[PDB]
PDB file of all heavy atoms in Angstrom:
ATOM      1  N   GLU R 177     -25.052 260.930 117.428  1.00 15.13           N
ATOM      2  CA  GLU R 177     -24.423 259.615 117.400  1.00 15.13           C
ATOM      3  C   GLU R 177     -24.664 258.949 118.745  1.00 15.13           C
ATOM      4  O   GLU R 177     -24.810 259.628 119.771  1.00 15.13           O
ATOM      5  CB  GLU R 177     -22.909 259.710 117.112  1.00 15.13           C
ATOM      6  CG  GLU R 177     -22.561 260.383 115.773  1.00 15.13           C
ATOM      7  CD  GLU R 177     -21.056 260.397 115.495  1.00 15.13           C
ATOM      8  OE1 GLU R 177     -20.469 259.299 115.369  1.00 15.13           O
ATOM      9  OE2 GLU R 177     -20.460 261.504 115.407  1.00 15.13           O
ATOM     10  N   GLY R 178     -24.755 257.626 118.741  1.00 15.40           N
ATOM     11  CA  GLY R 178     -25.104 256.909 119.945  1.00 15.40           C
ATOM     12  C   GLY R 178     -23.934 256.080 120.432  1.00 15.40           C
ATOM     13  O   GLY R 178     -22.970 255.825 119.715  1.00 15.40           O
ATOM     14  N   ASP R 179     -24.040 255.638 121.680  1.00 13.18           N
ATOM     15  CA  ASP R 179     -22.958 254.863 122.273  1.00 13.18           C
ATOM     16  C   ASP R 179     -23.076 253.376 121.965  1.00 13.18           C
ATOM     17  O   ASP R 179     -22.077 252.659 122.049  1.00 13.18           O
ATOM     18  CB  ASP R 179     -22.912 255.091 123.793  1.00 13.18           C
ATOM     19  CG  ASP R 179     -24.188 254.653 124.489  1.00 13.18           C
ATOM     20  OD1 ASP R 179     -25.274 255.154 124.137  1.00 13.18           O
ATOM     21  OD2 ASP R 179     -24.104 253.789 125.386  1.00 13.18           O
ATOM     22  N   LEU R 180     -24.263 252.910 121.588  1.00 12.62           N
ATOM     23  CA  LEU R 180     -24.475 251.527 121.162  1.00 12.62           C
ATOM     24  C   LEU R 180     -24.313 251.473 119.645  1.00 12.62           C
ATOM     25  O   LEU R 180     -25.195 251.929 118.909  1.00 12.62           O
ATOM     26  CB  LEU R 180     -25.859 251.030 121.580  1.00 12.62           C
ATOM     27  CG  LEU R 180     -26.271 251.183 123.052  1.00 12.62           C
ATOM     28  CD1 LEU R 180     -27.720 250.790 123.259  1.00 12.62           C
ATOM     29  CD2 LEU R 180     -25.364 250.348 123.930  1.00 12.62           C
ATOM     30  N   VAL R 181     -23.192 250.915 119.177  1.00 15.15           N
ATOM     31  CA  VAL R 181     -22.870 250.853 117.755  1.00 15.15           C
ATOM     32  C   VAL R 181     -23.230 249.439 117.307  1.00 15.15           C
ATOM     33  O   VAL R 181     -22.509 248.478 117.596  1.00 15.15           O
ATOM     34  CB  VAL R 181     -21.401 251.196 117.486  1.00 15.15           C
ATOM     35  CG1 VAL R 181     -21.131 251.245 115.986  1.00 15.15           C
ATOM     36  CG2 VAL R 181     -21.026 252.540 118.136  1.00 15.15           C
ATOM     37  N   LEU R 182     -24.346 249.323 116.595  1.00 17.07           N
ATOM     38  CA  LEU R 182     -25.076 248.078 116.391  1.00 17.07           C
ATOM     39  C   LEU R 182     -25.011 247.636 114.938  1.00 17.07           C
ATOM     40  O   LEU R 182     -24.866 248.453 114.028  1.00 17.07           O
ATOM     41  CB  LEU R 182     -26.550 248.225 116.796  1.00 17.07           C
ATOM     42  CG  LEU R 182     -26.825 248.602 118.258  1.00 17.07           C
ATOM     43  CD1 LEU R 182     -28.282 249.010 118.468  1.00 17.07           C
ATOM     44  CD2 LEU R 182     -26.404 247.502 119.229  1.00 17.07           C
ATOM     45  N   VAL R 183     -25.159 246.320 114.738  1.00 16.56           N
ATOM     46  CA  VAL R 183     -25.304 245.710 113.416  1.00 16.56           C
ATOM     47  C   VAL R 183     -26.608 244.903 113.431  1.00 16.56           C
ATOM     48  O   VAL R 183     -26.785 244.020 114.278  1.00 16.56           O
ATOM     49  CB  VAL R 183     -24.086 244.836 113.055  1.00 16.56           C
ATOM     50  CG1 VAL R 183     -24.310 244.082 111.721  1.00 16.56           C
ATOM     51  CG2 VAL R 183     -22.799 245.673 112.989  1.00 16.56           C
ATOM     52  N   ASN R 184     -27.537 245.237 112.529  1.00 16.44           N
ATOM     53  CA  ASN R 184     -28.855 244.592 112.491  1.00 16.44           C
ATOM     54  C   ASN R 184     -29.529 244.611 113.862  1.00 16.44           C
ATOM     55  O   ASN R 184     -30.177 243.646 114.265  1.00 16.44           O
ATOM     56  CB  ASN R 184     -28.732 243.165 111.962  1.00 16.44           C
ATOM     57  CG  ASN R 184     -28.368 243.147 110.497  1.00 16.44           C
ATOM     58  OD1 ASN R 184     -28.533 244.153 109.821  1.00 16.44           O
ATOM     59  ND2 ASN R 184     -27.885 242.021 109.999  1.00 16.44           N
ATOM     60  N   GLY R 185     -29.324 245.702 114.606  1.00 17.61           N
ATOM     61  CA  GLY R 185     -29.939 245.859 115.912  1.00 17.61           C
ATOM     62  C   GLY R 185     -29.288 245.060 117.016  1.00 17.61           C
ATOM     63  O   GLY R 185     -29.860 244.972 118.103  1.00 17.61           O
ATOM     64  N   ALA R 186     -28.106 244.487 116.777  1.00 20.43           N
ATOM     65  CA  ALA R 186     -27.394 243.674 117.753  1.00 20.43           C
ATOM     66  C   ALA R 186     -26.021 244.271 118.046  1.00 20.43           C
ATOM     67  O   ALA R 186     -25.394 244.878 117.172  1.00 20.43           O
ATOM     68  CB  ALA R 186     -27.239 242.227 117.245  1.00 20.43           C
ATOM     69  N   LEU R 187     -25.551 244.105 119.291  1.00 19.43           N
ATOM     70  CA  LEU R 187     -24.233 244.600 119.693  1.00 19.43           C
ATOM     71  C   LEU R 187     -23.181 243.536 119.405  1.00 19.43           C
ATOM     72  O   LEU R 187     -23.213 242.443 119.990  1.00 19.43           O
ATOM     73  CB  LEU R 187     -24.215 244.998 121.175  1.00 19.43           C
ATOM     74  CG  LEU R 187     -23.024 245.801 121.726  1.00 19.43           C
ATOM     75  CD1 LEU R 187     -22.808 247.128 121.020  1.00 19.43           C
ATOM     76  CD2 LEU R 187     -23.189 246.048 123.232  1.00 19.43           C
ATOM     77  N   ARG R 188     -22.259 243.856 118.498  1.00 18.15           N
ATOM     78  CA  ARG R 188     -21.144 243.002 118.093  1.00 18.15           C
ATOM     79  C   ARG R 188     -21.570 241.535 117.925  1.00 18.15           C
ATOM     80  O   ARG R 188     -21.071 240.655 118.632  1.00 18.15           O
ATOM     81  CB  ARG R 188     -19.985 243.123 119.075  1.00 18.15           C
ATOM     82  CG  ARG R 188     -19.564 244.555 119.272  1.00 18.15           C
ATOM     83  CD  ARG R 188     -18.320 244.613 120.120  1.00 18.15           C
ATOM     84  NE  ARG R 188     -18.639 244.642 121.540  1.00 18.15           N
ATOM     85  CZ  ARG R 188     -18.901 245.753 122.224  1.00 18.15           C
ATOM     86  NH1 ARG R 188     -18.894 246.934 121.613  1.00 18.15           N
ATOM     87  NH2 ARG R 188     -19.169 245.682 123.523  1.00 18.15           N
ATOM     88  N   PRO R 189     -22.483 241.253 117.003  1.00 18.84           N
ATOM     89  CA  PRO R 189     -22.818 239.857 116.705  1.00 18.84           C
ATOM     90  C   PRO R 189     -21.620 239.125 116.117  1.00 18.84           C
ATOM     91  O   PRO R 189     -20.638 239.729 115.675  1.00 18.84           O
ATOM     92  CB  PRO R 189     -23.946 239.982 115.679  1.00 18.84           C
ATOM     93  CG  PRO R 189     -23.585 241.258 114.934  1.00 18.84           C
ATOM     94  CD  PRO R 189     -23.058 242.181 116.008  1.00 18.84           C
ATOM     95  N   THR R 190     -21.708 237.797 116.123  1.00 21.30           N
ATOM     96  CA  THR R 190     -20.706 236.938 115.505  1.00 21.30           C
ATOM     97  C   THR R 190     -21.336 236.240 114.310  1.00 21.30           C
ATOM     98  O   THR R 190     -22.410 235.643 114.425  1.00 21.30           O
ATOM     99  CB  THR R 190     -20.162 235.889 116.489  1.00 21.30           C
ATOM    100  OG1 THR R 190     -19.373 236.524 117.504  1.00 21.30           O
ATOM    101  CG2 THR R 190     -19.294 234.854 115.754  1.00 21.30           C
ATOM    102  N   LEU R 191     -20.668 236.324 113.169  1.00 20.27           N
ATOM    103  CA  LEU R 191     -21.109 235.672 111.950  1.00 20.27           C
ATOM    104  C   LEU R 191     -20.153 234.524 111.670  1.00 20.27           C
ATOM    105  O   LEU R 191     -18.981 234.746 111.370  1.00 20.27           O
ATOM    106  CB  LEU R 191     -21.160 236.674 110.797  1.00 20.27           C
ATOM    107  CG  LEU R 191     -21.344 236.178 109.367  1.00 20.27           C
ATOM    108  CD1 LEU R 191     -22.515 235.228 109.234  1.00 20.27           C
ATOM    109  CD2 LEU R 191     -21.487 237.369 108.432  1.00 20.27           C
TER     110      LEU R 191
END
Side-chain angles (χ1 to χ4, degrees):
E177 301 183 63
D179 61 303
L180 308 173
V181 185
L182 300 168
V183 174
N184 291 342
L187 192 59
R188 306 187 273 274
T190 291
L191 169 51

